[PDB]
Amino acid sequence: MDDIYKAAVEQLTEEQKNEFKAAFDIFVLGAEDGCISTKELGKVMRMLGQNPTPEELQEMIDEVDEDGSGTVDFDEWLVMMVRCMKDDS
């Protein structure tokens, strides 16, 4: 019953869904398997100008997992956005 995530995805635009595919690639640019690891995601935050603890991302990916494989997919990425805007737990 995550309407917030259902509507958030719909409210999106052709540009958003299109750009969502670019970011995923930029994140897994070096990844061989093709998955964004907690370390990979954080590596981008470091060059951005911040320094988010590795305990946050790790716990985040797990909290935003569909099957709990420990990897964020194009789908889990779309929900990760709203999950933060409506983070309660």
Partner: peptide
């Protein structure tokens, strides 16, 4: 009634998407 999170940041990595 709120504003989207700071996601545009990563959008600027590629070059500058939705920078404004």
């Amino acid at each position: 009634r709120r504003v989207r999170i700071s996601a545009d940041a990563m959008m600027q990595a590629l070059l500058g998407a939705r920078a404004k």
